[PDB]
Amino acid sequence: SRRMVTLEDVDFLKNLGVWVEIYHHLEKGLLQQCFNLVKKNMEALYRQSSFGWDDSEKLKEMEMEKLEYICIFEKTSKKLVGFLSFEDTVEAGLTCLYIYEIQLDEHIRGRNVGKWLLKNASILAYRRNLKYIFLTVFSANLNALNFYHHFDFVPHESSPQEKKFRSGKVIHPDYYILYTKSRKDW
Ligand SMILES: CC(C)(COP(=O)(O)OP(=O)(O)OC[C@H]1O[C@@H](n2cnc3c(N)ncnc32)[C@H](O)[C@@H]1OP(=O)(O)O)[C@@H](O)C(=O)NCCC(=O)NCCS
Ligand SMILES: [Cl-]
């Protein structure tokens, strides 16, 4: 058929039939649910990268004390449908919120929930006197790459760069390090 930590704008989620919670640490059950979303969304991308995928390794990462979680659940099912995780840190001398994950279940993508999570992360960062937002992204993840570009992320000086030599050597990095300034006004 090809030719026919007070969060902002919570009312937006209410209008979608979802709600948000902030976690300092994930409880055992929810840890497993978030892991399931990351694995479902990302396993293939991790596999094809130099980083690889290890279930046990991703799990331990998500348990790290430094990571804070913003989680969105469906009002009817009370199931997790998305989250954003981050740490407050420093990157090359710059104070930042470093995003580890932004993950949405398939059925809730493309409805401005990604924007909602990113915007709130950015606001939180600014209010914590964190001047930048940083993240890593796979070069092969084209949708995410363009999503970030739209929200003014650009490669940090520390990001790997494309390189081509007359010798025939071609270097395509499998990830970028992106950043942008945090902002309180959206
Ligand atoms: C990446 C992700 C979180 C973005 O969420 P999303 O639901 O798809 O995007 P949203 O609907 O919330 O985006 C809203 C804004 O982003 C823009 N946008 C979204 N995707 C875009 C794309 N591929 N190219 C250009 N702009 C894009 C929209 O224009 C919109 O901006 P606007 O209101 O100013 O017009 C989502 O696609 C996802 O969960 N992907 C799977 C997991 C993943 O790859 N995470 C990144 C690695 S951790
Ligand atoms: Cl990615």
From Swiss-Prot:
It catalyses: N-terminal L-seryl-[histone H4] + acetyl-CoA = N-terminal N(alpha)-acetyl-L-seryl-[histone H4] + CoA + H(+); N-terminal L-seryl-[histone H2A] + acetyl-CoA = N-terminal N(alpha)-acetyl-L-seryl-[histone H2A] + CoA + H(+). Acetyl-CoA binds at residues 102-104, 110-115, 141. GO terms for biological process: protein maturation. It comes from the Eukaryota. CDD domains: NAT_SF. One of its GO terms (molecular function) is histone H2A acetyltransferase activity. SUPFAM superfamilies: Acyl-CoA N-acyltransferases (Nat). Its EC number is 2.3.1.257. The keyword Cytoplasm applies. InterPro entries: Acyl_CoA_acyltransferase, GNAT_dom, NAA40. It is found in: Cytoplasm; Nucleus. N-alpha-acetyltransferase that specifically mediates the acetylation of the N-terminal residues of histones H4 and H2A. This is N-alpha-acetyltransferase 40.
